[PDB]
Amino acid sequence: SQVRQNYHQDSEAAINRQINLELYASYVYLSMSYYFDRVALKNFAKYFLHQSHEEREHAEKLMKLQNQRGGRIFLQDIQKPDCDDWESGLNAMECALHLEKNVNQSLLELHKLATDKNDPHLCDFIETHYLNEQVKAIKELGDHVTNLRKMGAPESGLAEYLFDKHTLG
Amino acid sequence: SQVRQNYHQDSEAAINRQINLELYASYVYLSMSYYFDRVALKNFAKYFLHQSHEEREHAEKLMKLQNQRGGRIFLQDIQKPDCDDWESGLNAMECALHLEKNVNQSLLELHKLATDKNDPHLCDFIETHYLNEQVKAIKELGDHVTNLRKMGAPESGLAEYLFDKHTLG
Amino acid sequence: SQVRQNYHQDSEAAINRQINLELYASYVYLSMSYYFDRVALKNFAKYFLHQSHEEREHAEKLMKLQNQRGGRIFLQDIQKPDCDDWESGLNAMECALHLEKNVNQSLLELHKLATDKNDPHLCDFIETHYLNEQVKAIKELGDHVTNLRKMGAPESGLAEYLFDKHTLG
Amino acid sequence: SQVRQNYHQDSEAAINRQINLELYASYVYLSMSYYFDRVALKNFAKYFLHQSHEEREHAEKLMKLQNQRGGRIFLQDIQKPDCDDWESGLNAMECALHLEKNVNQSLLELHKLATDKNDPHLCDFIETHYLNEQVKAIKELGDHVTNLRKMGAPESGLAEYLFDKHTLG
Amino acid sequence: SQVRQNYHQDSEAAINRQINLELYASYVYLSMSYYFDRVALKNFAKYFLHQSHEEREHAEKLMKLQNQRGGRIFLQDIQKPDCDDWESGLNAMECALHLEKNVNQSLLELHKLATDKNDPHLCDFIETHYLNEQVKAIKELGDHVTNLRKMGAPESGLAEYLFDKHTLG
Amino acid sequence: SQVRQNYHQDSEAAINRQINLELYASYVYLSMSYYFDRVALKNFAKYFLHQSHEEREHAEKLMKLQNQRGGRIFLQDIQKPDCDDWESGLNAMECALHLEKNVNQSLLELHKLATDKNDPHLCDFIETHYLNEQVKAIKELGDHVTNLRKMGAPESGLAEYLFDKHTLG
Ligand SMILES: [Ca+2]
Ligand SMILES: [Ca+2]
Ligand SMILES: [Ca+2]
Ligand SMILES: [Ca+2]
Ligand SMILES: [Ca+2]
Ligand SMILES: [Ca+2]
Ligand SMILES: [Cl-]
Ligand SMILES: [Cl-]
Ligand SMILES: [Cl-]
Ligand SMILES: [Cl-]
Ligand SMILES: [Cl-]
Ligand SMILES: [Cl-]
Ligand SMILES: [Cl-]
Ligand SMILES: [Cl-]
Ligand SMILES: [Cl-]
Ligand SMILES: [Cl-]
Ligand SMILES: [Cl-]
Ligand SMILES: [Cl-]
Ligand SMILES: [Fe+3]
Ligand SMILES: [Fe+3]
Ligand SMILES: [Fe+3]
Ligand SMILES: [Fe+3]
Ligand SMILES: [Fe+3]
Ligand SMILES: [Fe+3]
Ligand SMILES: [Fe+3]
Ligand SMILES: [Fe+3]
Ligand SMILES: [Fe+3]
Ligand SMILES: [Fe+3]
Ligand SMILES: [Fe+3]
Ligand SMILES: [Fe+3]
Ligand SMILES: [Mg+2]
Ligand SMILES: [Mg+2]
Ligand SMILES: [Mg+2]
Ligand SMILES: [Mg+2]
Ligand SMILES: [Mg+2]
Ligand SMILES: [Mg+2]
Ligand SMILES: [Mg+2]
Ligand SMILES: [Mg+2]
Ligand SMILES: [Mg+2]
Ligand SMILES: [Mg+2]
Ligand SMILES: [Mg+2]
Ligand SMILES: [Mg+2]
Ligand SMILES: [Mg+2]
Ligand SMILES: [Mg+2]
Ligand SMILES: [Mg+2]
Ligand SMILES: [Mg+2]
Ligand SMILES: [Mg+2]
Ligand SMILES: [Mg+2]
Ligand SMILES: [Mg+2]
Ligand SMILES: [Mg+2]
Ligand SMILES: [Mg+2]
Ligand SMILES: [Mg+2]
Ligand SMILES: [Mg+2]
Ligand SMILES: [Mg+2]
Ligand SMILES: [Mg+2]
Ligand SMILES: [Mg+2]
């Protein structure tokens, strides 16, 4: 590649792995969205559909980065989510929180690699477009979990209904 | 399901298979798009990115249909595309044409099943939202293949450059 | 905390210390502002009041960060400023310069800690919202000191009057 | 001071004490605000942040008064609030009510002093800018306490959630 | 300097060297622009003139940085470009690509120095204003080279003419 | 050159020398500008930055002329200015006046050459775009020197401060 410069093969591979993980997160959220479409919590459905589109954008930005740095995108299967039945609004929020913490850990390992390979452009890319977005998403999901639990979810179906209307609406 | 009516278990399964195929088509087009981003044919890249978003919409409409009819969505892995290197604008257009004819065949088998199970709502759904969209997409890809070949692609890099500017721009 | 991830207890403590320092800086500037209100240099008063509001915003952003990362805010007394009588516009500018260099040193020690604990989100937070703001503030105060000295302050009361009108007005 | 007239040294001192108390109230409300930011009651957080800014304005108006009357501002440490963990929306409202009644008592003692020193300008200043503001704030906090208790707080987390949405939102 | 803080003499010197390099890049692009003005490829001329103005802005931002950090600007001769006759649009694009990779390498060495001297403000400055701009410029020039070669340049004068109209126009 | 007509080789060379001198003047003014940025005379800095951009335009117009007449641009190193520390606003204005008189002398020698070679287009070009611009710039710099001296510069730092505000602001 005539453009490649200071771009380690290990970073290229790690970026391909992160592309797959962002697409996976998009698929999990898509599944969650249509679960809540089925069980008639329309604002849970809207919230997770928006999250799913955001993760596709996350994946696309990494694909652009791979090309910008003179690497080559290598795609892999997007694994299906762990569940098709997400049980409750609270359970889906807890699963999303767990997912985003896992994605954050992968981004931190990616940043450690970029640091170890002295790749400041890649470090800046991760910090600028991913790390604070993860922190905000984790706190937001934590906040939703906190409120749903305090309201009496998941036993209180009234709680999940009112949360759908007042927080996600 | 208290809403399910005249919705055969075989149709439910076939709709889940079609959801996966539409997501697969979306992934193929996403791959094609970023291949052309890499090799600097920006309007090929834009064309296939738009196609990829359209297929995600196709998948989402089938997921909504599954829920509307009282079925249950069962997702599967989204397989990676056959190639990561799509070779040329002409080759990608030929591969997309082949893909859309395969998707059309699956939709026609779906319609045959809905006909065999006397499900006129499902027949109408397929006809209204999928069958003419497929015919239009197949003719459009065929037209692109026809013009690229007539211009001298794929040997003529000038041909693919000018097609990118004048047809896809 | 269900949101806390890669957030060292030492960083949490250092962020609480920085919150206190930003509030302290806000209080110093508030004192300076009303000193110049008393001695009738209204644009010195306006300048330092604006600086005081900016430091409160600095403190609030760190409090938000503490919460975002799953830490806990621990507030301490806000110490009164070193003076109630700031003597002259030049002396107040020199004191503000000294204060901002002290705050900068504390932020650099904070960044060293975040670096030592491999916390790239915290490093980015400090760089993005604090480090260049400090450099700009230090140069601006240095510039004000430079001009006031060149004009003949603090002996020339005319100098401070004209600086109030022409630079701070 | 060439402007000082009918301004007793005891009133000057009492005004300096009141400045400190208003800044203290601002700090208490700032603490309460970010507690509710942490535990995800965003409209409690907004309500107390607004209250904190109002108290800073209260302090600034007294600092302006001190200067207007030819006195000298003497600042003291701003003590940290009694708690960092405010327990519940109800508890924070009860603590704020107690604080505002304490501030009101200090303002009434200030007015008694201004009356005893035959300072009608100071009496009018306190009446015009502070006394009715205190009465309104006390009744408002009392009303919030009344409603939260009637709704079942603090045991009912649903109560505090719905109060956050419907009264503070 | 009363403003200088955590700013190593080696970094100051390296910033002066980078100022000279950015001015040099501006001069190379100015030369390329008027070469294409002479041989009547007006959009090549416009493209490189814009690039030349961008590099002057790059140099000016580093001069501002030098002053902001309490250093002193030391200018050196701006060397003339390697060629006055740039041969072809393709050759100029290849020369610009080589230049931008050389400038990128100098910026990465600058970042390594700022890292070695624990200067996070300087690291952030380089990352924020220079490193991604370099990556984008390198990929863009690589893309132009890729397309011109695929079109048949430099032998095909038609290729360079059409590229001037369709990509740079 | 198929366009060259009545364009002597000596004039072509003299135009290349004038291009270099205009770029040199641009560099001197750029240096002066950032000197005043450093020592906090912001309107001196703005004035000289504008002058520096004007000289780059002067150089570009001569480069266009060289091409228009069928000559060839030959660039040379742009020498660094005589000083990096310009001492005072008055000294910089005196140095700029000296520079512009030197540039004027070179333009008058250029016009003498164009006259000697019976090149009326070149004579008109110099008269139309350069000679009156030089006379205006020389008188303007002379006026600035006159006022700064009358105000008490360079000993009076107040003088330079007020001139920065009232004449250059
Ligand atoms: Ca950065
Ligand atoms: Ca129909
Ligand atoms: Ca960063
Ligand atoms: Ca009254
Ligand atoms: Ca940064
Ligand atoms: Ca004429
Ligand atoms: Cl590399
Ligand atoms: Cl981010
Ligand atoms: Cl059925
Ligand atoms: Cl259709
Ligand atoms: Cl942790
Ligand atoms: Cl900053
Ligand atoms: Cl009195
Ligand atoms: Cl009132
Ligand atoms: Cl230093
Ligand atoms: Cl950048
Ligand atoms: Cl001739
Ligand atoms: Cl003129
Ligand atoms: Fe998200
Ligand atoms: Fe993501
Ligand atoms: Fe399509
Ligand atoms: Fe489709
Ligand atoms: Fe500030
Ligand atoms: Fe601050
Ligand atoms: Fe209030
Ligand atoms: Fe108050
Ligand atoms: Fe550029
Ligand atoms: Fe540059
Ligand atoms: Fe000029
Ligand atoms: Fe000139
Ligand atoms: Mg490879
Ligand atoms: Mg599996
Ligand atoms: Mg290395
Ligand atoms: Mg950011
Ligand atoms: Mg079933
Ligand atoms: Mg496989
Ligand atoms: Mg039947
Ligand atoms: Mg139709
Ligand atoms: Mg703790
Ligand atoms: Mg003390
Ligand atoms: Mg660690
Ligand atoms: Mg920044
Ligand atoms: Mg006294
Ligand atoms: Mg204490
Ligand atoms: Mg009396
Ligand atoms: Mg009233
Ligand atoms: Mg030095
Ligand atoms: Mg040389
Ligand atoms: Mg050090
Ligand atoms: Mg860093
Ligand atoms: Mg950036
Ligand atoms: Mg010649
Ligand atoms: Mg020399
Ligand atoms: Mg002749
Ligand atoms: Mg004449
Ligand atoms: Mg004229």
Side-chain angles (χ1 to χ4, degrees):
Chain A
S1 171
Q2 67 187 345
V3 305
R4 196 184 186 127
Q5 177 171 37
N6 197 36
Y7 193 51
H8 201 282
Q9 294 257 358
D10 296 355
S11 316
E12 178 180 13
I15 289 290
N16 281 328
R17 292 193 307 268
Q18 189 71 30
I19 287 162
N20 188 259
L21 184 53
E22 303 288 340
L23 293 169
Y24 173 75
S26 179
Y27 203 18
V28 173
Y29 281 129
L30 178 66
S31 178
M32 291 179 176
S33 175
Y34 279 90
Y35 169 77
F36 290 105
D37 178 80
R38 176 161 57 78
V39 304
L41 288 168
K42 296 333 182 153
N43 290 322
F44 277 92
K46 172 192 71 164
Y47 177 79
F48 287 127
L49 191 59
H50 178 76
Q51 300 312 314
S52 163
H53 297 152
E54 287 185 338
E55 302 295 341
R56 184 181 61 254
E57 292 176 340
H58 283 198
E60 288 192 42
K61 188 173 299 189
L62 283 152
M63 296 173 72
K64 183 67 165 207
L65 179 285
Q66 188 73 281
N67 287 347
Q68 286 174 306
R69 291 299 299 274
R72 278 173 316 146
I73 296 159
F74 287 138
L75 299 175
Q76 301 300 337
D77 295 351
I78 306 164
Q79 302 281 5
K80 70 177 179 170
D82 273 356
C83 310
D84 283 291
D85 173 355
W86 293 98
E87 288 181 27
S88 69
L90 174 58
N91 183 64
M93 291 288 184
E94 291 179 332
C95 286
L97 175 59
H98 185 75
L99 168 67
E100 295 299 350
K101 287 168 80 190
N102 277 334
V103 173
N104 199 34
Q105 181 57 42
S106 169
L107 289 160
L108 293 171
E109 291 165 1
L110 187 44
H111 193 284
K112 175 182 143 45
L113 173 65
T115 294
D116 286 347
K117 303 301 193 187
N118 307 302
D119 190 337
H121 174 264
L122 184 48
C123 292
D124 169 81
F125 173 86
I126 296 159
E127 288 165 58
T128 299
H129 301 291
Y130 292 84
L131 295 186
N132 192 55
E133 261 296 294
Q134 273 326 95
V135 162
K136 286 186 305 189
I138 290 170
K139 183 49 159 70
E140 177 173 287
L141 289 164
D143 289 349
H144 292 342
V145 170
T146 294
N147 276 290
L148 278 158
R149 288 184 183 149
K150 273 255 189 223
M151 292 168 75
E155 295 102 319
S156 169
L158 187 54
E160 301 215 331
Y161 172 90
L162 291 178
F163 185 85
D164 175 276
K165 300 295 194 187
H166 295 139
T167 295
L168 302 179
Chain B
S1 171
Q2 67 187 345
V3 305
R4 196 184 186 127
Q5 177 171 37
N6 197 36
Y7 193 51
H8 201 282
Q9 294 257 358
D10 296 355
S11 316
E12 178 180 13
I15 289 290
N16 281 328
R17 292 193 307 268
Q18 189 71 30
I19 287 162
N20 188 259
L21 184 53
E22 303 288 340
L23 293 169
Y24 173 75
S26 179
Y27 203 18
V28 173
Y29 281 129
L30 178 66
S31 178
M32 291 179 176
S33 175
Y34 279 90
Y35 169 77
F36 290 105
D37 178 80
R38 176 161 57 78
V39 304
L41 288 168
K42 296 333 182 153
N43 290 322
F44 277 92
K46 172 192 71 164
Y47 177 79
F48 287 127
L49 191 59
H50 178 76
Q51 300 312 314
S52 163
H53 297 152
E54 287 185 338
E55 302 295 341
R56 184 181 61 254
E57 292 176 340
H58 283 198
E60 288 192 42
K61 188 173 299 189
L62 283 152
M63 296 173 72
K64 183 67 165 207
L65 179 285
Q66 188 73 281
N67 287 347
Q68 286 174 306
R69 291 299 299 274
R72 278 173 316 146
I73 296 159
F74 287 138
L75 299 175
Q76 301 300 337
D77 295 351
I78 306 164
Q79 302 281 5
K80 70 177 179 170
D82 273 356
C83 310
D84 283 291
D85 173 355
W86 293 98
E87 288 181 27
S88 69
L90 174 58
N91 183 64
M93 291 288 184
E94 291 179 332
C95 286
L97 175 59
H98 185 75
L99 168 67
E100 295 299 350
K101 287 168 80 190
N102 277 334
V103 173
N104 199 34
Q105 181 57 42
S106 169
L107 289 160
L108 293 171
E109 291 165 1
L110 187 44
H111 193 284
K112 175 182 143 45
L113 173 65
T115 294
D116 286 347
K117 303 301 193 187
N118 307 302
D119 190 337
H121 174 264
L122 184 48
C123 292
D124 169 81
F125 173 86
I126 296 159
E127 288 165 58
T128 299
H129 301 291
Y130 292 84
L131 295 186
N132 192 55
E133 261 296 294
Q134 273 326 95
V135 162
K136 286 186 305 189
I138 290 170
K139 183 49 159 70
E140 177 173 287
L141 289 164
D143 289 349
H144 292 342
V145 170
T146 294
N147 276 290
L148 278 158
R149 288 184 183 149
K150 273 255 189 223
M151 292 168 75
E155 295 102 319
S156 169
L158 187 54
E160 301 215 331
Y161 172 90
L162 291 178
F163 185 85
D164 175 276
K165 300 295 194 187
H166 295 139
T167 295
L168 302 179
Chain C
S1 171
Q2 67 187 345
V3 305
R4 196 184 186 127
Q5 177 171 37
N6 197 36
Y7 193 51
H8 201 282
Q9 294 257 358
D10 296 355
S11 316
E12 178 180 13
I15 289 290
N16 281 328
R17 292 193 307 268
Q18 189 71 30
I19 287 162
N20 188 259
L21 184 53
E22 303 288 340
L23 293 169
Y24 173 75
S26 179
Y27 203 18
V28 173
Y29 281 129
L30 178 66
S31 178
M32 291 179 176
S33 175
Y34 279 90
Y35 169 77
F36 290 105
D37 178 80
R38 176 161 57 78
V39 304
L41 288 168
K42 296 333 182 153
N43 290 322
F44 277 92
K46 172 192 71 164
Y47 177 79
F48 287 127
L49 191 59
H50 178 76
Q51 300 312 314
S52 163
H53 297 152
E54 287 185 338
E55 302 295 341
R56 184 181 61 254
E57 292 176 340
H58 283 198
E60 288 192 42
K61 188 173 299 189
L62 283 152
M63 296 173 72
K64 183 67 165 207
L65 179 285
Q66 188 73 281
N67 287 347
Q68 286 174 306
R69 291 299 299 274
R72 278 173 316 146
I73 296 159
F74 287 138
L75 299 175
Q76 301 300 337
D77 295 351
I78 306 164
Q79 302 281 5
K80 70 177 179 170
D82 273 356
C83 310
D84 283 291
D85 173 355
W86 293 98
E87 288 181 27
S88 69
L90 174 58
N91 183 64
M93 291 288 184
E94 291 179 332
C95 286
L97 175 59
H98 185 75
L99 168 67
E100 295 299 350
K101 287 168 80 190
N102 277 334
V103 173
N104 199 34
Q105 181 57 42
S106 169
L107 289 160
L108 293 171
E109 291 165 1
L110 187 44
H111 193 284
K112 175 182 143 45
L113 173 65
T115 294
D116 286 347
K117 303 301 193 187
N118 307 302
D119 190 337
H121 174 264
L122 184 48
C123 292
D124 169 81
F125 173 86
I126 296 159
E127 288 165 58
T128 299
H129 301 291
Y130 292 84
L131 295 186
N132 192 55
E133 261 296 294
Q134 273 326 95
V135 162
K136 286 186 305 189
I138 290 170
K139 183 49 159 70
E140 177 173 287
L141 289 164
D143 289 349
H144 292 342
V145 170
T146 294
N147 276 290
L148 278 158
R149 288 184 183 149
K150 273 255 189 223
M151 292 168 75
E155 295 102 319
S156 169
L158 187 54
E160 301 215 331
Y161 172 90
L162 291 178
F163 185 85
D164 175 276
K165 300 295 194 187
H166 295 139
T167 295
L168 302 179
Chain D
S1 171
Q2 67 187 345
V3 305
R4 196 184 186 127
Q5 177 171 37
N6 197 36
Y7 193 51
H8 201 282
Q9 294 257 358
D10 296 355
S11 316
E12 178 180 13
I15 289 290
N16 281 328
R17 292 193 307 268
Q18 189 71 30
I19 287 162
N20 188 259
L21 184 53
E22 303 288 340
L23 293 169
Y24 173 75
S26 179
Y27 203 18
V28 173
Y29 281 129
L30 178 66
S31 178
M32 291 179 176
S33 175
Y34 279 90
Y35 169 77
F36 290 105
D37 178 80
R38 176 161 57 78
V39 304
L41 288 168
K42 296 333 182 153
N43 290 322
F44 277 92
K46 172 192 71 164
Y47 177 79
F48 287 127
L49 191 59
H50 178 76
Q51 300 312 314
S52 163
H53 297 152
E54 287 185 338
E55 302 295 341
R56 184 181 61 254
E57 292 176 340
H58 283 198
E60 288 192 42
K61 188 173 299 189
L62 283 152
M63 296 173 72
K64 183 67 165 207
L65 179 285
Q66 188 73 281
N67 287 347
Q68 286 174 306
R69 291 299 299 274
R72 278 173 316 146
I73 296 159
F74 287 138
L75 299 175
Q76 301 300 337
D77 295 351
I78 306 164
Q79 302 281 5
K80 70 177 179 170
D82 273 356
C83 310
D84 283 291
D85 173 355
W86 293 98
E87 288 181 27
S88 69
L90 174 58
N91 183 64
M93 291 288 184
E94 291 179 332
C95 286
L97 175 59
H98 185 75
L99 168 67
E100 295 299 350
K101 287 168 80 190
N102 277 334
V103 173
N104 199 34
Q105 181 57 42
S106 169
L107 289 160
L108 293 171
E109 291 165 1
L110 187 44
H111 193 284
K112 175 182 143 45
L113 173 65
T115 294
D116 286 347
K117 303 301 193 187
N118 307 302
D119 190 337
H121 174 264
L122 184 48
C123 292
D124 169 81
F125 173 86
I126 296 159
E127 288 165 58
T128 299
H129 301 291
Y130 292 84
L131 295 186
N132 192 55
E133 261 296 294
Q134 273 326 95
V135 162
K136 286 186 305 189
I138 290 170
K139 183 49 159 70
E140 177 173 287
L141 289 164
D143 289 349
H144 292 342
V145 170
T146 294
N147 276 290
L148 278 158
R149 288 184 183 149
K150 273 255 189 223
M151 292 168 75
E155 295 102 319
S156 169
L158 187 54
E160 301 215 331
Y161 172 90
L162 291 178
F163 185 85
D164 175 276
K165 300 295 194 187
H166 295 139
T167 295
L168 302 179
Chain E
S1 171
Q2 67 187 345
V3 305
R4 196 184 186 127
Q5 177 171 37
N6 197 36
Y7 193 51
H8 201 282
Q9 294 257 358
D10 296 355
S11 316
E12 178 180 13
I15 289 290
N16 281 328
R17 292 193 307 268
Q18 189 71 30
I19 287 162
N20 188 259
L21 184 53
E22 303 288 340
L23 293 169
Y24 173 75
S26 179
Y27 203 18
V28 173
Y29 281 129
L30 178 66
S31 178
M32 291 179 176
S33 175
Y34 279 90
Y35 169 77
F36 290 105
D37 178 80
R38 176 161 57 78
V39 304
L41 288 168
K42 296 333 182 153
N43 290 322
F44 277 92
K46 172 192 71 164
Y47 177 79
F48 287 127
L49 191 59
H50 178 76
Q51 300 312 314
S52 163
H53 297 152
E54 287 185 338
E55 302 295 341
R56 184 181 61 254
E57 292 176 340
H58 283 198
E60 288 192 42
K61 188 173 299 189
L62 283 152
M63 296 173 72
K64 183 67 165 207
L65 179 285
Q66 188 73 281
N67 287 347
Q68 286 174 306
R69 291 299 299 274
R72 278 173 316 146
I73 296 159
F74 287 138
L75 299 175
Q76 301 300 337
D77 295 351
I78 306 164
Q79 302 281 5
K80 70 177 179 170
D82 273 356
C83 310
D84 283 291
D85 173 355
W86 293 98
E87 288 181 27
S88 69
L90 174 58
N91 183 64
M93 291 288 184
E94 291 179 332
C95 286
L97 175 59
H98 185 75
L99 168 67
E100 295 299 350
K101 287 168 80 190
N102 277 334
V103 173
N104 199 34
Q105 181 57 42
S106 169
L107 289 160
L108 293 171
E109 291 165 1
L110 187 44
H111 193 284
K112 175 182 143 45
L113 173 65
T115 294
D116 286 347
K117 303 301 193 187
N118 307 302
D119 190 337
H121 174 264
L122 184 48
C123 292
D124 169 81
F125 173 86
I126 296 159
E127 288 165 58
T128 299
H129 301 291
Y130 292 84
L131 295 186
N132 192 55
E133 261 296 294
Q134 273 326 95
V135 162
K136 286 186 305 189
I138 290 170
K139 183 49 159 70
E140 177 173 287
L141 289 164
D143 289 349
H144 292 342
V145 170
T146 294
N147 276 290
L148 278 158
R149 288 184 183 149
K150 273 255 189 223
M151 292 168 75
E155 295 102 319
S156 169
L158 187 54
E160 301 215 331
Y161 172 90
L162 291 178
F163 185 85
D164 175 276
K165 300 295 194 187
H166 295 139
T167 295
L168 302 179
Chain F
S1 171
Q2 67 187 345
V3 305
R4 196 184 186 127
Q5 177 171 37
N6 197 36
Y7 193 51
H8 201 282
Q9 294 257 358
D10 296 355
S11 316
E12 178 180 13
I15 289 290
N16 281 328
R17 292 193 307 268
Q18 189 71 30
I19 287 162
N20 188 259
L21 184 53
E22 303 288 340
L23 293 169
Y24 173 75
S26 179
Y27 203 18
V28 173
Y29 281 129
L30 178 66
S31 178
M32 291 179 176
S33 175
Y34 279 90
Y35 169 77
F36 290 105
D37 178 80
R38 176 161 57 78
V39 304
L41 288 168
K42 296 333 182 153
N43 290 322
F44 277 92
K46 172 192 71 164
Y47 177 79
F48 287 127
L49 191 59
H50 178 76
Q51 300 312 314
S52 163
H53 297 152
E54 287 185 338
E55 302 295 341
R56 184 181 61 254
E57 292 176 340
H58 283 198
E60 288 192 42
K61 188 173 299 189
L62 283 152
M63 296 173 72
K64 183 67 165 207
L65 179 285
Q66 188 73 281
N67 287 347
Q68 286 174 306
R69 291 299 299 274
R72 278 173 316 146
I73 296 159
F74 287 138
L75 299 175
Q76 301 300 337
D77 295 351
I78 306 164
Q79 302 281 5
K80 70 177 179 170
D82 273 356
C83 310
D84 283 291
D85 173 355
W86 293 98
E87 288 181 27
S88 69
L90 174 58
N91 183 64
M93 291 288 184
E94 291 179 332
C95 286
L97 175 59
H98 185 75
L99 168 67
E100 295 299 350
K101 287 168 80 190
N102 277 334
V103 173
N104 199 34
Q105 181 57 42
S106 169
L107 289 160
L108 293 171
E109 291 165 1
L110 187 44
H111 193 284
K112 175 182 143 45
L113 173 65
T115 294
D116 286 347
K117 303 301 193 187
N118 307 302
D119 190 337
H121 174 264
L122 184 48
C123 292
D124 169 81
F125 173 86
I126 296 159
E127 288 165 58
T128 299
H129 301 291
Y130 292 84
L131 295 186
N132 192 55
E133 261 296 294
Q134 273 326 95
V135 162
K136 286 186 305 189
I138 290 170
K139 183 49 159 70
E140 177 173 287
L141 289 164
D143 289 349
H144 292 342
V145 170
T146 294
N147 276 290
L148 278 158
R149 288 184 183 149
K150 273 255 189 223
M151 292 168 75
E155 295 102 319
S156 169
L158 187 54
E160 301 215 331
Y161 172 90
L162 291 178
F163 185 85
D164 175 276
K165 300 295 194 187
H166 295 139
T167 295
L168 302 179

